[PDB]
Amino acid sequence: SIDVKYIGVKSAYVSYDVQKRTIYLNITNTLNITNNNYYSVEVENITAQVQFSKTVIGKARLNNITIIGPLDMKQIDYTVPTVIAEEMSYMYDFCTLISIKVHNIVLMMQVTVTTTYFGHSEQISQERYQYVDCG
Amino acid sequence: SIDVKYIGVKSAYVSYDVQKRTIYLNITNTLNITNNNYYSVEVENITAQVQFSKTVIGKARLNNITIIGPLDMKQIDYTVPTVIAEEMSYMYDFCTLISIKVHNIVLMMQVTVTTTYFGHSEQISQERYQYVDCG
Amino acid sequence: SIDVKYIGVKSAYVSYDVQKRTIYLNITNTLNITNNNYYSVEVENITAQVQFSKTVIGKARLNNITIIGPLDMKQIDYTVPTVIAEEMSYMYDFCTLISIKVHNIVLMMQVTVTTTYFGHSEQISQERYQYVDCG
Numbered sequence: 001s002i003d004v005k006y007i008g009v010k011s012a013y014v015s016y017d018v019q020k021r022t023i024y025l026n027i028t029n030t031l032n033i034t035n036n037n038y039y040s041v042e043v044e045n046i047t048a049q050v051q052f053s054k055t056v057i058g059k060a061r062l063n064n065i066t067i068i069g070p071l072d073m074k075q076i077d078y079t080v081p082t083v084i085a086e087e088m089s090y091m092y093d094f095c096t097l098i099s100i101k102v103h104n105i106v107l108m109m110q111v112t113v114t115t116t117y118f119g120h121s122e123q124i125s126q127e128r129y130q131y132v133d134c135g
Numbered sequence: 136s137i138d139v140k141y142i143g144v145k146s147a148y149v150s151y152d153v154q155k156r157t158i159y160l161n162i163t164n165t166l167n168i169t170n171n172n173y174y175s176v177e178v179e180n181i182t183a184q185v186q187f188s189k190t191v192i193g194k195a196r197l198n199n200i201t202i203i204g205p206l207d208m209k210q211i212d213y214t215v216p217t218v219i220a221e222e223m224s225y226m227y228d229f230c231t232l233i234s235i236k237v238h239n240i241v242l243m244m245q246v247t248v249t250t251t252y253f254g255h256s257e258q259i260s261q262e263r264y265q266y267v268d269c270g
Numbered sequence: 271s272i273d274v275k276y277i278g279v280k281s282a283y284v285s286y287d288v289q290k291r292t293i294y295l296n297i298t299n300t301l302n303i304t305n306n307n308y309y310s311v312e313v314e315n316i317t318a319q320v321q322f323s324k325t326v327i328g329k330a331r332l333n334n335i336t337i338i339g340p341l342d343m344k345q346i347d348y349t350v351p352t353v354i355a356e357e358m359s360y361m362y363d364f365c366t367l368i369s370i371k372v373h374n375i376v377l378m379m380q381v382t383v384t385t386t387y388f389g390h391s392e393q394i395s396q397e398r399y400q401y402v403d404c405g
């Protein structure tokens with residue numbers, strides 16, 4: 001990345017801003033902007049690139065061979081009982097939340113067992129989070 | 136990436152902004168903008184690129200061979216009982232949520248077992264999250 | 271990517287904006303904009319690109335061979351009982367949600383077992399999330 005910007009409200013190169021209930025009288029504004037941008041990003045000069053994978057098996061006895069990749073979830077139990085017994089009561093639940101395994105952003109790249117790779121990998125995440133808002 | 140921008144409300148190169156209840160009188164605005172952008176991104180010069188995969192098996196005895204890739208979910212149990220017994224009660228549930236395995240963004244790239252790859256991988260995520268809003 | 275922009279409300283190169291209840295009198299605006307953009311993106315110069323996959327089996331005995339790719343979901347149980355018994359009660363459920371495995375964005379790319387690939391992979395996601403709004 002080159003230019004990553006997070007701005008809460010207002011982003012401006014030039015901002016002539018006047019707010020409310022304001023007197024803006026007898027103003028002479030002169031502005032000259034000579035802006036130039038030159039970009040040379042991700043230039044590659046490879047005369048020879050070689051990726052080689054070789055597997056050779058000869059008169060071999062293989063048994064009980066197990067290969068497991070990443071992210072192996074096994075024998076997982078969730079138990080969230082919710083028992084509510086009432087007896088001449090006044091129940092007032094305004095905003096009650098029961099969240100189980102809530103995912104917002106899941107970015108996965110090159111999650112493998114055997115990988116051979118060359119170059120650039122980029123991940124960018126921007127957000128403005130707000131889970132619960134009870135007024 | 137080159138230019139990634141997040142702006143909450145207002146994005147402007149030049150912003151002459153006047154708000155409410157404002158007096159904007161006798162104004163002389165002169166503006167000159169000479170803006171130039173030059174972009175040279177992702178240029179590749181490869182004279183020779185080779186990817187080679189070779190597998191050779193000779194008089195080999197293979198048994199009980201198991202290969203499992205990523206993201207292996209096995210024997211997963213969710214149990215969320217919800218028992219509500221009432222007896223001359225006044226139930227007032229305004230905004231009650233029961234969320235199980237809620238996914239918003241799931242981006243998956245190159246999730247394999249054996250991978251051979253060359254170049255650029257980019258992932259960009261932008262959002263403005265708001266789960267619960269109870270007024 | 272080159273130019274990724276998220277703007278909440280207003281995006282403008284030049285914004286002469288006047289809000290409500292405003293007096294905008296005796297104004298002389300002069301604007302000159304000489305804007306030039308030059309783009310050279312994703313240029314590839316390959317004299318020779320080779321991808322080679324070879325499998326050779328000779329007098330080989332293979333047994334009990336198992337290969338499983340990614341995203342293997344097995345023996346998954348969801349149980350969400352909802353028992354509600356009433357006895358001279360006043361039930362007031364305004365906005366009650368029961369969500370199970372809710373997906374919004376699922377982008378999948380190159381989710382394989384054996385992959386051989388060359389170049390550029392890009393994923394872009396933009397959203398403005400709002401799950402629950404109870405007024």
Ligand SMILES: *[C@@H]1O[C@H](CO)[C@@H](O)[C@H](O)[C@H]1NC(C)=O
Pocket residue numbers: 025026161
């Ligand atoms: C604004 O400028 C004009 C011309 O120069 C002038 O006549 C006027 O008096 C100025 N305003 C005030 C409030 O003096």
Ligand SMILES: *[C@@H]1O[C@H](CO)[C@@H](O)[C@H](O)[C@H]1NC(C)=O
Pocket residue numbers: 030031032033034167
């Ligand atoms: C920008 O404009 C002003 C306005 O008179 C001028 O004086 C200045 O020489 C200009 N600059 C360029 C680089 O054009």
Ligand SMILES: *[C@@H]1O[C@H](CO)[C@@H](O)[C@H](O)[C@H]1NC(C)=O
Pocket residue numbers: 043044045180
């Ligand atoms: C890549 O191309 C040639 C070959 O190597 C080299 O002379 C040149 O300077 C390189 N380009 C850049 C932008 O570096």
Ligand SMILES: *[C@@H]1O[C@H](CO)[C@@H](O)[C@H](O)[C@H]1NC(C)=O
Pocket residue numbers: 064199
């Ligand atoms: C390992 O080998 C034994 C006997 O050789 C067999 O009983 C067992 O099942 C094998 N393991 C697996 C995971 O298959």
Ligand SMILES: *[C@@H]1O[C@H](CO)[C@@H](O)[C@H](O)[C@H]1NC(C)=O
Pocket residue numbers: 160161296
């Ligand atoms: C605005 O400019 C004009 C012309 O220059 C001038 O006659 C007038 O008086 C100015 N406004 C005020 C409020 O002075």
Ligand SMILES: *[C@@H]1O[C@H](CO)[C@@H](O)[C@H](O)[C@H]1NC(C)=O
Pocket residue numbers: 032034165166167168169302
């Ligand atoms: C921009 O415009 C102003 C207005 O007079 C001028 O003075 C300046 O020389 C200009 N600049 C260019 C680079 O054209």
Ligand SMILES: *[C@@H]1O[C@H](CO)[C@@H](O)[C@H](O)[C@H]1NC(C)=O
Pocket residue numbers: 043178179180315
């Ligand atoms: C790629 O093309 C030729 C061959 O390598 C080289 O001379 C040139 O400079 C390269 N181009 C860039 C933009 O680097």
Ligand SMILES: *[C@@H]1O[C@H](CO)[C@@H](O)[C@H](O)[C@H]1NC(C)=O
Pocket residue numbers: 199334
């Ligand atoms: C492993 O081998 C044994 C006997 O050779 C067999 O009973 C068992 O089922 C094998 N494992 C699997 C996972 O098949």
Ligand SMILES: *[C@@H]1O[C@H](CO)[C@@H](O)[C@H](O)[C@H]1NC(C)=O
Pocket residue numbers: 295296
């Ligand atoms: C606006 O400009 C005109 C012409 O220059 C001038 O006669 C007038 O008085 C100006 N307005 C005010 C409120 O002065």
Ligand SMILES: *[C@@H]1O[C@H](CO)[C@@H](O)[C@H](O)[C@H]1NC(C)=O
Pocket residue numbers: 167169300301302303304
């Ligand atoms: C832009 O327009 C203004 C208006 O007079 C002028 O002065 C300036 O020279 C112009 N610039 C270009 C680059 O054309």
Ligand SMILES: *[C@@H]1O[C@H](CO)[C@@H](O)[C@H](O)[C@H]1NC(C)=O
Pocket residue numbers: 178313314315
């Ligand atoms: C690609 O074409 C030729 C052959 O390599 C080279 O001279 C040229 O500079 C390259 N083009 C770019 C835009 O790099």
Ligand SMILES: *[C@@H]1O[C@H](CO)[C@@H](O)[C@H](O)[C@H]1NC(C)=O
Pocket residue numbers: 199334
């Ligand atoms: C593994 O081999 C044994 C005997 O050779 C067989 O009973 C079993 O079913 C095999 N495993 C699978 C998964 O088929």
